[PDB]
């Protein structure tokens, strides 16, 4: 009769799943940061493209003016 | 000769060994080429566990054999 | 009827091991996302700085177009 061996061992496996869930909750806290890092990256990428967009239009205005100086000379 | 090691996940790895190599040596070859620590390796065949101190010839490993790796 | 619940426990354990591997994947990407966020901030700050240096180097040169406007 290995019932005592089996009745004890099933409690031992239930101890294993207890540890897996505890570690799973600790992991869940860490994984919650992913959307914040993604959102932050998307913001800085948008702000960068906004600055680059503005700079391109500035350079085209300057190059048109530096051309006006080249001709008016 | 070239041998194969069978895992619990259906993966089979190829090894280059010597007949004079120990079971410890086979685990060292697995560590060097696959990164699996030898301390976690437990080799099983025909219901027999291979001991670290013995070599491949000690266990009568014949042709077309497949070894089992338990962690 | 010994395995009546033992195999059930092994089933729950195995599905939690697969969950653990998926968790280890996500957490492995976390520092990469942080480095990406810090890089995008740097490239943004640099692009704003490079734009302001350009706005100066042109709006200041606008006075030159007023110099050659006296003729």
């Amino acid at each position: 009769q290995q019932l005592q061996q089996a009745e004890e061992a099933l409690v031992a496996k239930q101890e294993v799943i207890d540890k897996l869930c505890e570690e799973a909750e600790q992991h869940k806290i860490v994984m919650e940061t992913v959307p914040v890092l993604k959102a932050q990256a998307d913001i800085y990428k948008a702000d960068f493209q906004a600055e680059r967009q503005a700079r391109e239009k500035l350079a085209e205005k300057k190059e048109l003016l530096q051309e006006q100086l080249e001709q008016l000379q | 000769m070239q041998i194969f090691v069978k895992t619990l996940t259906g993966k089979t790895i190829t090894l280059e060994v010597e007949p004079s190599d120990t079971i410890e040596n086979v685990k060292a070859k697995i560590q060097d080429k696959e990164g699996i620590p030898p301390d976690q390796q437990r080799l099983i065949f025909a219901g027999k566990q291979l001991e670290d101190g013995r070599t491949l010839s000690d266990y009568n490993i014949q042709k077309e054999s497949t070894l089992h790796l338990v962690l | 009827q010994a395995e009546e619940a033992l195999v059930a426990k092994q089933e729950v354990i195995d599905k939690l091991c697969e969950e653990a591997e998926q968790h280890k994947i996500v957490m492995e990407t976390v520092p990469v996302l942080k480095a990406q966020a810090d890089i995008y901030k740097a490239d943004f700050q640099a692009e704003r700085q490079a734009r302001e240096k350009l706005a100066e180097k042109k709006e200041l040169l606008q006075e030159q177009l007023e110099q050659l406007q006296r003729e």
């Binding site: - | 437990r42 099983i44 219901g47 338990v70 | 092994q10």
Partner: peptide
Amino acid sequence: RWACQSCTFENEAAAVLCSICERPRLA
């Protein structure tokens, strides 16, 4: 005796788990 269905270890009849991989007898 029972042979483990994951690593083919031939266990004792009274063994509930495999001696080497601890998987149940009927797993």
